[PDB]
């Protein structure tokens, strides 16, 4: 586990706070993963995954989008 | 057959359903989606109004339009 | 769904496979020879200036025909 | 201001979006002064109704 | 007829050359220039090797040149001249005639090409560019190329001491 | 008769070259493009040369690194005078 | 190569053809006074873009153009393998690929491939 | 040499161009599909029957709205930039490797890198051009770009050729009978890949035509025509790169089927890192094509050598 | 006003077809250039290109007919930063004083033919802004308008409703029959 | 994997270079006779061109 | 933006606009909310930590957003004081201030 530059206190979350790791194990995945593209293919991976996905699209005008009975639209007298 | 041959059963169905494959094609031409559902209402003014809750929500109840227009 | 993008598709590999195959019938019609000669080589160009010089058709071959009983 | 691609002096210009607001809302009830919160900020609208 | 129209055409280029101010009009002119020279440099060897690597240096060098266009100098005046147009066209009609109503074996080069050297050489039925780039890394003159390698180096070194690129970027009034 | 007929074009070319390198031009960066003629020009006639003889083309690369080092000492140069004064004008340059 | 000269020829015809098909099939309004300005973002330019550009890479440039005519020399030894000797073919090879990387890790060292700033 | 053939190769260079004209339409169509697939969204479905003749109402609209006539520009050199664009853009496409005789490219490499640098040079012609800040950022964009990746682009291609022993495309085939080169190539399979699309000016390379960070780059001041040859001179670029990465990286034949899914593959491929990765800078993308392409080609150049060495005293 | 046609009236009545010039028109030339008007209105009225503005609000609706639950890709209409490269201009907000001549300038830039969106009450008729000092009393003022989307938000089915009505118009747009009768 | 491709390759080459030497000898020698029939018929044609 | 229009979708159940709701008001709100967005809302949250850990998983790691984020733009902390900032651009220069817990 990497280490903590600045101990956070109860109740608050610190970003960009982990120091990076300066053993050989730690060292030699983050060289890997940069000359090999590592975190490029997980991205591309899961672009690939989500263009299996069903499209949230609706055929309008035959298919209209979710309304609500207090929805303001044309005044109207009646 | 576990990737998706019954899909293209159901294609079949849907183009049985149509009416014939010209037929299926001026649906699929005039409706940019080809899809299959029960037929719930006739407005007065001759629209068709079709609900299947197979699909996403959105797309659950559609409308096909006069034959006229 | 993600099968619509197959339409649009087959038609950029089918029409760029058309300029190959097109000429594997278009040397047949007229050369007689599905693959003209190729010159990249002096040896290739010269033995082509042989067959050019021979008949007025490189790729018309003359066979044992061409020679005399003797 | 651009020596190459980069900048020397940013001076940004405002008031393109400027609609009179505050002196609209010196002029109409705090029910009609409600909606201009909406107005105010663009894609946070309940939190600028909490506000007011 | 092809290399008498390559005569014309770089004739008239050159013309045009000669009368240009504006340092885009010179770099046009030199582009169509070196295609011509390119072109024209092909015809004389048995390989098409060299003319490619003349486009490759000379389209490596102007590239820099438009930089330094649009650095010094972007602000200048074209002049169209009708005499200019005129007197090209005149010159290169003119060449063409002459070019059409010329003998063209007594014009041709008398340089061979891979076609022009006879059956007999065996050294013609060999890859294209063995022999001509072999001595470019053979015994007697590899040491010139060594010599341009550390030719090159002080050349950079040169560039790196005569442009200081901590004294800031370079335009016009810095 | 000969020398007219073979070769004589481009010593005309390299001359109209030269006159293009020292005529009255404004700038600096002309004159390099003129530098780039030459080195065309030049090109021509020692590729004439070097193919008048059979497998002596490969110095043909050489005449070019040459000329682009050449080249790059002209553009440094020009880069040299934007240390000392603000333009390339070549009427700004002291004439002593 | 006559026969690559005629088809580029034909094919800036083409492409002439079907620019020249472009503008006259197009919509012929007339020309107002303000649609033909530089857009400059919908408001007043301020300057010309002919004013002088500031170069930030004037060494990088010089560097690739070096490194270019570099490339022109290294582009023969394919073919001159299989027709040397394979001793001065290697010393002349290893030999020019170490001096290009002492060359570009030393100008690496000092930082001068990094623009001016 | 005889008649025929110069007829022949008339109709197929003809035809290639007329298929590469289609297929670079199809392109725009795949790419507005799957690009739109690589989000939720769906492509275009309702111009046409499903979206098919979606290009033919793009290419309808650009050839009949009005010419820009711009005011601050040399209109003599602003109209002659995309024809040019175009004309190389096709021109390049004489370099394929057919398996009849179509060209007898025996220097096929140094045509590719010829082409190659005069397509940049159309572009940043129509860049100075147009007499618009943008379209000069742009332009100088494109040629900071192109400096970048120039270098790195030739001495990776020796390394392929080194593979090969000959300038000749067609030697790809006969040396990758038993296997692509997919095998030993991957770190050039992503090298070739990132020069590519700095090659096409394309994400994460787009600073030629930024549609954040300019408007519309160099393409600001060109409208109905010029924006048109343009765009199908970029489109044929991605569909020339995309079958150099068939020819040199999988199989160079030309009679199977399988060779133009492999390109139509490759295509989407490069429509799907545009749809992922964020747009780099061009500081970032000449700190990268100097200090870490250009090394590493230069190290894996010395690996070729000394492996070419090693096969050649075996053999 | 007229109503929708009852069913059996609806069968009464054949199909309109797509052509709205109709059919025929007793003439060869008027027939051929009524199918070229076709051609040509299909071509303009498929993948008009909007322009990047966003003035205000209204155009975080404009990205929802970019969000993919309505997708305005699919009818071709896809957003191009230049104005030169666009047919339409969304102008979706309040135009205010300062933006007068910005509007101009960028509505004059972009080239014939020209189709303008008036998305938004402030884009109407200046709206919650109308009585103010800075804010232009509606974009009809300083440009032509061909439609007016007139929700305050609209909805992006509202949205596309306009664009799609904007097509029609396109499709009803005649050209060369004009020619021929001018 | 490339080692026998190229193993492959390099006896292909090696067919077509034998086959290229066992033609090669017909074709000089039709080459020097035609040669010297033209050489006889150029200076057959110079000398009565030059008379 | 497609959790984004559910969010405006809930946004027209509870008070009838898709983005102007007019919906909080001087002394609470305006009207209840409907029967049934409890579970709307809670499949929605549900969904959403998948959702963002796709997009995470997209742009967080990348070396490409992380050289066109990172070390650009740096403001210090008694430059953030002195200049007035406020919320996140107090947040991220290292300064714990956030308004829903100091002065809830
Ligand atoms: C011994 C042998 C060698 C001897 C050499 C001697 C000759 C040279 C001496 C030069 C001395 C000198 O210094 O002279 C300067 C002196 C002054 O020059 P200037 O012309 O005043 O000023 C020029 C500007 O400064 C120019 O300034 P600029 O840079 O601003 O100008 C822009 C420049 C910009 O130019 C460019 O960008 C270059 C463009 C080149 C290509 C164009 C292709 C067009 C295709 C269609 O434009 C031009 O230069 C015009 C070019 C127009 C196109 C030419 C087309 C034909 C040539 C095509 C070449 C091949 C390319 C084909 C395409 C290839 C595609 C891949 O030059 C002259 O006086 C010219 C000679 C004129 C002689 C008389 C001509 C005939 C009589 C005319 C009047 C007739 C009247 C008839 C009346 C009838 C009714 C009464
Ligand atoms: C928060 O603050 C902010 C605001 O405040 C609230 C704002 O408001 C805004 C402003 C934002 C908005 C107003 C809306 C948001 C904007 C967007 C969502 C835009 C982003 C989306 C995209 C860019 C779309 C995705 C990209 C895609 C799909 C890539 C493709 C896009 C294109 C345009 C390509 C289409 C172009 C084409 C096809 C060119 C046409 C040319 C051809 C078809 C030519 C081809 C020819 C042929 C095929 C045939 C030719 C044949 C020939 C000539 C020969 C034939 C001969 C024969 C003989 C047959 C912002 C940014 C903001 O931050
Ligand atoms: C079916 C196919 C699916 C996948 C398709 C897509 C393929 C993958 C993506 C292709 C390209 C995508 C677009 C371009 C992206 C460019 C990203 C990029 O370069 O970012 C810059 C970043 C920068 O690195 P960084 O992100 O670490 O930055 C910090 C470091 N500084 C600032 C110093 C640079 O990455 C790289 O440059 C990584 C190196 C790339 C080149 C590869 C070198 C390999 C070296 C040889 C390895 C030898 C191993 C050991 C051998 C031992 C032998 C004894
Ligand atoms: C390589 C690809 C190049 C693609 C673009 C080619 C452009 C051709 C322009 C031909 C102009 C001919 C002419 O008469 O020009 C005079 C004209 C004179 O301008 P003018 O405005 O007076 O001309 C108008 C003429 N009348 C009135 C008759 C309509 O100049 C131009 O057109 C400008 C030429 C600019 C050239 C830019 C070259 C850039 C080179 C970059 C690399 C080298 C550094
Ligand atoms: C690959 C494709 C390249 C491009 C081919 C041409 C454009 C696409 C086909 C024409 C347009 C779409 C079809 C159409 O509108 O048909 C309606 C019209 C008929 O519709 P209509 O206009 O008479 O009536 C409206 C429709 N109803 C009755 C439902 C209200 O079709 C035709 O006129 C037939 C044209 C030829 C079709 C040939 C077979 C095509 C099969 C699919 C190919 C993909
Ligand atoms: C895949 C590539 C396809 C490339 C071509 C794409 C389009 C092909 C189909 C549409 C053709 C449209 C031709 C006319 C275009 C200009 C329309 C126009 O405004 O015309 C007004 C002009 C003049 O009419 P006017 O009187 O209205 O014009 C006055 C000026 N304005 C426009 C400002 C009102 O009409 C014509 O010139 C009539 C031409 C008829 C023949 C056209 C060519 C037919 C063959 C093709
Ligand atoms: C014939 C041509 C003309 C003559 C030759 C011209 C070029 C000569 C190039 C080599 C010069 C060597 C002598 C000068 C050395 C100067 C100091 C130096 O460069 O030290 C090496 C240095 C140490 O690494 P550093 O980056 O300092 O790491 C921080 C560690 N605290 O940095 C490194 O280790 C990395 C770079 C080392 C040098 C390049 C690679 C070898
Ligand atoms: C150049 C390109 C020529 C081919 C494409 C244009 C002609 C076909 C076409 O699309 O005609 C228009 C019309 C369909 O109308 P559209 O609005 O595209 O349909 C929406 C519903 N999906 O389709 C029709 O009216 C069909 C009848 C005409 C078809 C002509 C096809 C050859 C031309
Ligand atoms: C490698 C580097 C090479 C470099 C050298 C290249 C040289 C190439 C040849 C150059 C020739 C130049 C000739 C120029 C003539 C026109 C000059 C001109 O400027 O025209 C202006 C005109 C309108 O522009 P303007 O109103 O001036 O607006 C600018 C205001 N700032 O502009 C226009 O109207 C635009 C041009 C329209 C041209 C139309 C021509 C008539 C139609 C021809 C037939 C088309 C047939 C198509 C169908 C065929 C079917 C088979
Ligand atoms: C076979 C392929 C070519 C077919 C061409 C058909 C042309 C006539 C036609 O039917 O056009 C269809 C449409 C206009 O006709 P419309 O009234 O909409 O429908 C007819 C109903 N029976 O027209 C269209 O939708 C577009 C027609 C394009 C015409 C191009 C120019 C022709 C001259
Ligand atoms: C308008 C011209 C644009 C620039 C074209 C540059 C082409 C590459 C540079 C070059 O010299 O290539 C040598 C090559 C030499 O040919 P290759 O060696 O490529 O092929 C042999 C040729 C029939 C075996 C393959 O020639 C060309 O590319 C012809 C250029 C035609 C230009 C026409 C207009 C004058
Ligand atoms: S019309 Fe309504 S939503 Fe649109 S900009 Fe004006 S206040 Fe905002």
């Given amino acids: ?78 | ?69 | ?70 | ?52 | ?174 | ?96 | ?117 | ?315 | ?182 | 994997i490339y080692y026998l491709t190229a193993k492959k390759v390099k006896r292909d080459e090696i067919e077509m270079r034998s086959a290229q030497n066992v033609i090669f000898p017909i074709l000089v020698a039709e080459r020097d006779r035609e040669f010297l029939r033209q050489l006889r018929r150029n200076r057959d044609e110079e000398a009565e061109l030059m008379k | 933006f497609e959790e984004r229009e559910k969010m405006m979708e809930f946004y027209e159940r509870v008070s009838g606009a898709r983005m102007h709701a007019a919906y909080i008001r001087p002394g609470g709100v305006s009207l209840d909310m409907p029967l049934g967005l409890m579970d709307d809302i809670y499949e929605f949250a549900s969904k959403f930590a998948e959702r963002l850990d796709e997009v995470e998983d997209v742009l967080t790691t990348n070396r490409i957003w992380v050289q066109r984020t990172e070390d650009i733009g740096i403001v210090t902390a008694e430059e953030a004081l002195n200049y007035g900032f406020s919320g996140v651009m107090l947040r991220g220069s290292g300064i714990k201030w956030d308004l829903r817990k100091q002065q809830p």
């Fill in chain 5, 1 to 174: 007829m092809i290399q008498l129209m390559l005569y014309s055409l770089i004739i008239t280029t050159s013309i045009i050359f000669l009368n240009m101010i504006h340092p885009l009009a010179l770099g046009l002119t030199l582009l169509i220039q070196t295609i011509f020279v390119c072109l024209l440099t092909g015809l004389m060897t048995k390989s098409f090797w060299y003319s490619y690597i003349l486009f490759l240096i000379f389209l490596g060098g102007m590239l820099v040149l438009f930089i330094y266009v649009t650095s010094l100098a972007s602000n200048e005046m074209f002049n169209l001249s009708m005499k200019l147009t005129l007197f090209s066209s005149l010159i290169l009609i003119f060449m063409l005639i002459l070019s059409f109503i010329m003998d063209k074996t007594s014009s041709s080069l008398f340089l061979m090409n891979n076609d022009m050297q006879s059956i007999i050489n065996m050294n013609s039925y060999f890859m294209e560019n063995s022999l001509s780039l072999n001595k470019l890394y053979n015994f007697p003159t590899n040491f010139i190329t060594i010599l341009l390698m550390n030719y090159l180096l002080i050349t950079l070194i040169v560039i790196v001491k005569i442009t200081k690129l901590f004294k800031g970027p370079i335009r016009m009034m810095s």
């Fill in chain 3, 1 to 70: 769904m993600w099968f619509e993008i197959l339409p649009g598709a087959v038609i950029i590999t089918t029409l760029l496979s058309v300029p190959i195959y097109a000429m594997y019938g278009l040397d047949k019609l007229m050369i007689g020879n599905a693959f003209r000669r190729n010159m990249d080589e002096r040896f290739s160009r010269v033995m082509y200036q042989r067959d050019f010089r021979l008949t007025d058709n490189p790729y018309k071959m003359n066979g044992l025909e061409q020679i005399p009983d003797e």
């Fill in chain 9, 1 to 182: 006003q007229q109503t929708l046609p009852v069913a059996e009236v609806a069968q009464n009545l054949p199909k309109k077809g797509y052509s709205p010039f109709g059919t025929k028109q007793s003439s060869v030339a008027e027939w051929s250039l009524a199918r070229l008007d076709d051609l040509l209105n299909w071509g303009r009225k498929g993948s008009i290109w909007p322009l990047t503005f966003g003035l205000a609000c209204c155009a975080v609706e404009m990205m929802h007919i970019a969000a993919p639950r309505y997708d305005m890709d699919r009818y071709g209409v896809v957003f191009r930063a230049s104005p030169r490269q666009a047919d339409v201009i969304i102008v979706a907000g309040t135009l205010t004083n300062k933006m007068a001549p910005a509007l101009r300038k960028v509505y004059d830039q972009m080239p014939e033919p020209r189709w303008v969106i008036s998305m938004g009450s402030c884009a109407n008729g200046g709206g919650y802004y109308h009585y103010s000092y800075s804010v232009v009393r509606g974009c009809d003022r300083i440009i032509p308008v061909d439609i007016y989307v007139p929700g305050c938000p609209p909805t992006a089915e509202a949205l596309m409703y306009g664009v799609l009505q904007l097509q029609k118009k396109v499709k009803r747009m005649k050209t060369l029959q004009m020619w021929y009768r001018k």
């Fill in chain 1, 1 to 78: 586990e990497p280490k903590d530059i600045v101990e956070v206190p109860k109740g608050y979350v610190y970003v960009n706070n982990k120091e990076l790791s300066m053993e050989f194990a730690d060292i030699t995945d983050r060289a890997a993963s940069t000359m090999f593209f590592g975190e490029l293919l997980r991205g591309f991976a899961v672009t690939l995954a989500h263009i299996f996905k069903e499209p949230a699209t609706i055929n309008y005008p035959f298919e209209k989008g979710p309304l609500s009975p207090r929805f303001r639209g044309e005044h109207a007298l009646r």
């Fill in chain 6, 1 to 96: 008769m000969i020398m007219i007929l073979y070769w004589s074009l481009p010593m005309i070319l390299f001359i109209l070259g030269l006159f293009c390198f020292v005529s009255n031009r404004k700038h600096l960066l002309s004159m390099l493009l003129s530098l780039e003629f030459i080195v065309l020009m030049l090109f021509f006639m020692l590729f004439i040369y070097l193919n008048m003889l059979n497998y002596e083309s490969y110095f043909s690369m050489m005449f070019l690194t040459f000329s682009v080092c050449e080249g790059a000492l002209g553009l440094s140069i020009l880069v040299s005078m934007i240390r000392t004064h603000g333009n390339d004008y070549f009427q700004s340059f002291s004439i002593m």
């Fill in chain 4, 1 to 52: 201001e651009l020596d190459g691609e980069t900048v020397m002096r940013a001076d940004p210009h405002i008031g393109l979006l400027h609609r009179g607001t505050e002196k609209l809302i010196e002029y109409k009830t705090y029910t009609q002064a409600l909606p201009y919160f909406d107005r105010l900020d663009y894609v946070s609208m309940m939190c600028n109704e909490q506000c007011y």
């Fill in chain 2, 1 to 69: 057959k576990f990737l998706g041959i019954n899909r293209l059963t159901k294609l079949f169905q849907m183009v049985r359903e149509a009416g014939g494959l010209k037929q299926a094609y001026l649906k699929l031409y005039r409706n940019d989606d080809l899809k299959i559902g029960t037929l719930v209402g006739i407005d007065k003014y001759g629209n068709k109004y079709f609900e299947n809750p197979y699909y996403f929500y959105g797309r659950n109840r559609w409308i096909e339009f006069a034959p006229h227009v």
């Fill in chain 7, 1 to 117: 190569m006559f026969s690559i000269i005629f088809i580029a020829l034909l094919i800036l015809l083409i492409t002439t053809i079907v620019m020249f098909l472009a503008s006259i099939l197009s919509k012929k309004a007339l020309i107002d006074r303000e649609k033909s300005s530089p857009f400059e973002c919908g408001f007043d330019p301020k300057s010309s873009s002919r004013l002088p550009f500031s170069l930030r890479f004037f060494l990088i440039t010089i560097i690739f153009l070096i490194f270019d005519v570099e490339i022109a020399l290294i582009l023969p030894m394919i073919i001159i393998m299989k027709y040397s000797n394979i001793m001065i073919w290697t010393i002349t090879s290893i030999i020019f690929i170490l001096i290009l990387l002492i060359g570009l890790y030393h100008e690496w060292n000092q930082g001068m491939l990094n623009w001016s700033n």
């Fill in chain 8, 1 to 315: 040499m005889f008649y025929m053939e110069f007829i022949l190769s008339l109709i197929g260079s003809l035809l290639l161009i007329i298929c590469v004209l289609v297929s670079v339409a199809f392109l725009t169509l795949l790419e507005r599909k799957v690009l739109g697939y690589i989000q939720i969204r769906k492509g275009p479905n309702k111009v046409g029957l499903m979206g098919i003749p979606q290009p033919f109402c793009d290419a309808i609209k650009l050839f009949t709205k009005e010419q820009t006539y711009p005011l601050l520009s040399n209109y003599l050199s602003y109209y002659i930039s995309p024809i040019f664009s175009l004309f190389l853009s096709l021109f390049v496409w004489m370099c394929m490797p057919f398996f009849v005789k179509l060209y007898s490219f025996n220097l096929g490499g140094l045509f590719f890198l010829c082409c190659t640098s005069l397509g940049v040079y159309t572009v940043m012609v129509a860049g100075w051009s147009s007499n618009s800040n943008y379209a000069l950022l742009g332009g100088l964009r494109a040629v900071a770009q192109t400096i970048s990746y120039e270098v790195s682009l030739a001495l990776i291609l020796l390394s392929f050729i080194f593979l090969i022993g000959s300038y000749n495309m067609i030697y790809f085939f006969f040396y990758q009978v038993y296997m692509w080169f997919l095998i030993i190539l991957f770190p050039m399979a992503l090298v070739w890949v990132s020069i590519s699309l700095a090659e096409t000016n394309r994400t994460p390379f787009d600073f030629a035509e930024g549609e954040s960070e300019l408007v519309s780059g160099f393409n600001v001041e060109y409208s109905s025509g010029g924006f048109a040859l343009i765009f199908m001179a970029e489109y044929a670029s991605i569909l020339f790169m995309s079958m150099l990465f068939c020819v040199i990286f999988l199989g160079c034949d030309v009679f199977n089927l399988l060779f133009y899914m492999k390109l139509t593959f490759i295509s989407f491929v490069f429509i799907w890192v545009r749809g992922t990765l964020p747009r780099f800078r061009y500081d970032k993308l000449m700190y990268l094509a100097w200090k870490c392409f250009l090394s590493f080609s230069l190290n894996y150049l010395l690996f070729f050598i000394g492996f070419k060495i090693l096969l050649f005293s075996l053999l």
